[PDB]
Design a protein around this ligand. Sequence first.
Ligand SMILES: [Mg+2]
Ligand SMILES: [Mg+2]
Ligand SMILES: [Mg+2]
Ligand SMILES: [Mg+2]
Ligand SMILES: [Mg+2]
Ligand SMILES: [Mg+2]
Ligand SMILES: [Mg+2]
Ligand SMILES: [Mg+2]
Ligand SMILES: [Mg+2]
Ligand SMILES: [Mg+2]
Ligand SMILES: [Mg+2]
Ligand SMILES: [Mg+2]
Ligand SMILES: [Mg+2]
Ligand SMILES: [Mg+2]
Ligand SMILES: [Mg+2]
Ligand SMILES: [Mg+2]
Ligand SMILES: [Mg+2]
Ligand SMILES: [Mg+2]
Ligand SMILES: [Mg+2]
Ligand SMILES: [Mg+2]
Ligand SMILES: [Zn+2]
Ligand SMILES: [Zn+2]
Lengths: 91, 103, 212, 101, 25, 136, 80, 97
Amino acid sequence: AKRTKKVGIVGKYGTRYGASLRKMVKKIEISQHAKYTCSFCGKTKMKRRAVGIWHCGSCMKTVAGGAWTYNTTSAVTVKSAIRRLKELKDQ
Amino acid sequence: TKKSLESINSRLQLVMKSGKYVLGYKQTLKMIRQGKAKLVILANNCPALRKSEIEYYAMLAKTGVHHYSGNNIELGTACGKYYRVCTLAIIDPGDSDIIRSMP
Amino acid sequence: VDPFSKKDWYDVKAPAMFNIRNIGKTLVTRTQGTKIASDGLKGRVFEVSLADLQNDEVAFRKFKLITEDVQGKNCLTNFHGMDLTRDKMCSMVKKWQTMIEAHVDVKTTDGYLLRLFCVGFTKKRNNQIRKTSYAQHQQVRQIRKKMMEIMTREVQTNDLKEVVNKLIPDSIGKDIEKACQSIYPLHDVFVRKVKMLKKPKFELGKLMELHG
Amino acid sequence: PVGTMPEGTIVCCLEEKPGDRGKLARASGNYATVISHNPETKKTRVKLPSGSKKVISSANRAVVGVVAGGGRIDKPILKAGRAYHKYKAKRNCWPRVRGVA
Amino acid sequence: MRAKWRKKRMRRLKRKRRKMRQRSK
Amino acid sequence: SLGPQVAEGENVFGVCHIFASFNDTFVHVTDLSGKETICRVTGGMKVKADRDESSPYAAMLAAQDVAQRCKELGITALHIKLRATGGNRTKTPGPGAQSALRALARSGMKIGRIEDVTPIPSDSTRRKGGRRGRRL
Amino acid sequence: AKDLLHPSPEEEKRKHKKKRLVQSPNSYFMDVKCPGCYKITTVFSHAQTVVLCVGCSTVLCQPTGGKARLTEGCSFRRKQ
Amino acid sequence: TKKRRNNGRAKKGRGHVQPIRCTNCARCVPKDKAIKKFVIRNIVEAAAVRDISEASVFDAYVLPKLYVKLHYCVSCAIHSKVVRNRSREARKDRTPP
RNA sequence: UUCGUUAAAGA
RNA sequence: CGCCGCUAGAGGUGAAAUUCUUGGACCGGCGCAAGACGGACCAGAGCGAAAGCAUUUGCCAAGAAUGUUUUCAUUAAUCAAGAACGAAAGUCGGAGGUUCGAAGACGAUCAGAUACCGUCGUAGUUCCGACCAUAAACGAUGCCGACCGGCGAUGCGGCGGCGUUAUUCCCAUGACCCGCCGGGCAGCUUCCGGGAAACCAAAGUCUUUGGGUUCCGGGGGGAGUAUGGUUGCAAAGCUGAAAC
Ligand SMILES: [Mg+2]
Ligand SMILES: [Mg+2]
Ligand SMILES: [Mg+2]
Ligand SMILES: [Mg+2]
Ligand SMILES: [Mg+2]
Ligand SMILES: [Mg+2]
Ligand SMILES: [Mg+2]
Ligand SMILES: [Mg+2]
Ligand SMILES: [Mg+2]
Ligand SMILES: [Mg+2]
Ligand SMILES: [Mg+2]
Ligand SMILES: [Mg+2]
Ligand SMILES: [Mg+2]
Ligand SMILES: [Mg+2]
Ligand SMILES: [Mg+2]
Ligand SMILES: [Mg+2]
Ligand SMILES: [Mg+2]
Ligand SMILES: [Mg+2]
Ligand SMILES: [Mg+2]
Ligand SMILES: [Mg+2]
Ligand SMILES: [Zn+2]
Ligand SMILES: [Zn+2]
């Protein structure tokens, strides 16, 4: 049964600190509490460790990710540029 | 290359319903030791120790090796079952020619 | 004051075997103070047209030169690029044709790397009634591949002497015209620009080898 | 070292002087842009996270990539409690009283 | 007078009346 | 002094830039390198009227002054480059150049070939006028 | 007043496949005679796939949109 | 009523045409609607071509042509006399010689 | 380059 | 912006001034940095459901059309509710900020400008994530199916033609020419018929009125307003009457 229609996970905060601030904290709390697909063991056990650190459940292979998601879009752009400069004309 | 990938998926679809196959590392080990397996299929992101061990067993037993450019989730999708799989061995292809085309 | 009473005159010596080694005369401020007279002369360039370098060839296909150094009141220049005139470039662009572009970077035999272009226009065949004369764009992609392909295996195996001796009769454009007719009858394929962007070293011994 | 990498190489934790083990661009989610190499007079321009273009030597080192933990200032602190715990973790930089008051 | 600016002035009057309702419900 | 060349018969060249705008006219004699400016007289340097500094009369006066300074400094022939405000404005040349070419050819100054090196943009960067643009 | 019941054969050939009366197809079956040893192969005119002879293992019909082009000029017949 | 069947421009297949700036008033007009002509002028007026040819260096070997894509809008082109008005049976005509 | 207004009716 | 050269003015307008300059403005030559932009080629041409889409190359999936002696076998057309996109402007975060530029400040013309003209410039215009769902979103013209004139062209496939032109020479496509087929954007004429006419091969097959289906109008204002319901951060969007 759907109980909250707008606040979602932010209903633990209740009536305080503004609709816009709660709306902007909603997406990133979903991002920090969502389980991500592990790229190594193929499971969905990426549990959030401390900030910047992501930790898969099985196979214990700790990865250094973003502060709120698993891959920052800027970080993916940096990785694409680094591999492009890698295979660009052999350094 | 997409013709080759769709060919590999179609051959796996044929082996799924017509051929005889085993699933998983501990079940492919018995086949690669008994020599019943002819072709083995590795995932992209299987761990490198298990990958090197299966490659070493296959080049001892004269068994074709095929790497699968894809996560084990879509390798399980390609073999048509809802779980995931990292290692396959086609011990008897029914109507396919994976053991004929690639080696 | 009268600074032109103080200003000095040099004359420009072109590199070898165009036809001659004369371009013109330039003004030098003086060798007064800390600023030596050979300082700005190394940076001075030239944009010279033809009918004075190629022994009565076409008036377009201009050449870009740069003064390498000066040696005994004779400022010596060297190749830096090559352009075409504005009236020729804006001319032969008909409203009912297909304009095909090409551009490619290539390294020479020595440490020079040049970026050379290519322009192509379609041709109404003799006794043609249809006024459009377009292409199916796959011939356009194929001829972009072909014109990018030809210039690489000319200029990759040949340094500045051979590529300027190939740009003297436009052997590259005639070779594209030769290898072009099986795809489409394209009309007046030129290069339209080739400019330098990398330079290895001064190398006055290589400059003397450029002379002879 | 920055003399090996080409231009546009996005690095972090680079050195001011060669051999002081990482000084510039060390906070979370920051990087530097390597441009304008020089064969003679061994220098290299780097665009810092502040936007300053610093000329450094060509022998100092830098780990290739960006610092993990990016986006840390995306979430509002949203209450005084998390700010108190953050500053209790860092240092007593928080007797922030208004100078007019 | 244009129908455009007639609609826009009735729109501004609508905004003023909505603010008046929110001021004194 | 006499200049660079004694016993004439060989032309000493100069690049003459003509920047013909709809409010002023620039005639600018330079050497072949492009750095050493020989002479430069505008329309406002010859006509007091700011409304008439773009006139062909102003072009004739400025070009006669430039040709006199070039004959004093001792250069014979001129290659001519022509341009206007071509960045985003009208690419057509102004009214001054059509008479400035005449006033260079009249008082000496043997002309070589003339090229229209006008700054042509590639792909029409943002125009000053606006949506509906200039209105009277 | 056009004779629709008895039209001209040239007009019925120049009309479209299905627009005309009998709606006969414009395809046929041709008898490719490969010069290898003996084999004559019946093949559809608008052959969508490659055609491999069982004796010489060569491609007789290249796949082409429209109708299939051939190899070096083997003969054919019309069986209608 | 309909004054034109073409509604001014030539957009009949597509639905959006790029606005290209006018020359005089610099108003953005779609390029199938604006008056787009092509002027090939001589770089010297013929009243001074003969003077430059007599006072030139080369012996009549160079004659450059100035090419301009003249691009008016239909609000200033009528004032600039190019696209003057015609009658109801005269709007259907084509290019004059 | 700019130049404002003239109602009700009266065929 | 940094070097080099020359010199008194250089933008700007119908006209001048506000602006920058002997501290070197503007102009030329070289180099650097920034972001926006893809002309000419560009057409009563193409694609896409529309809005829209134009530098090269690679990758990813998608689709019309065509040729189908291919396959399934009525699986179909339109659609209350509901749902996906949806120009530009506008709103919420993040990076920068070239040009233009709402508001704003001035310099002018007029009796009066706070406007049209000029100078500077904020939000925005750019990109990545979210919202809004509006336009002269136009062909002011619902979709599907058939019929009723001709002509000349164009784009895409298919077919035929000891014609011409390119390779080295049969050989296969390339380029042009002639004709046909299908569907597509279009054009000229017509007493085919309609309509009040403009005009329309559809706006025809309608008093000789009926192929199927959806949405909407009932004199002009009030008024797309008030009041309710609902969506939205808000601007506002959807539904939307009465008195007179
Ligand atoms: Mg912030
Ligand atoms: Mg504070
Ligand atoms: Mg306080
Ligand atoms: Mg107190
Ligand atoms: Mg209005
Ligand atoms: Mg109160
Ligand atoms: Mg009217
Ligand atoms: Mg539209
Ligand atoms: Mg009256
Ligand atoms: Mg400059
Ligand atoms: Mg928008
Ligand atoms: Mg705010
Ligand atoms: Mg913003
Ligand atoms: Mg105002
Ligand atoms: Mg303004
Ligand atoms: Mg401005
Ligand atoms: Mg509407
Ligand atoms: Mg509808
Ligand atoms: Mg065709
Ligand atoms: Mg082909
Ligand atoms: Zn894991
Ligand atoms: Zn205009």
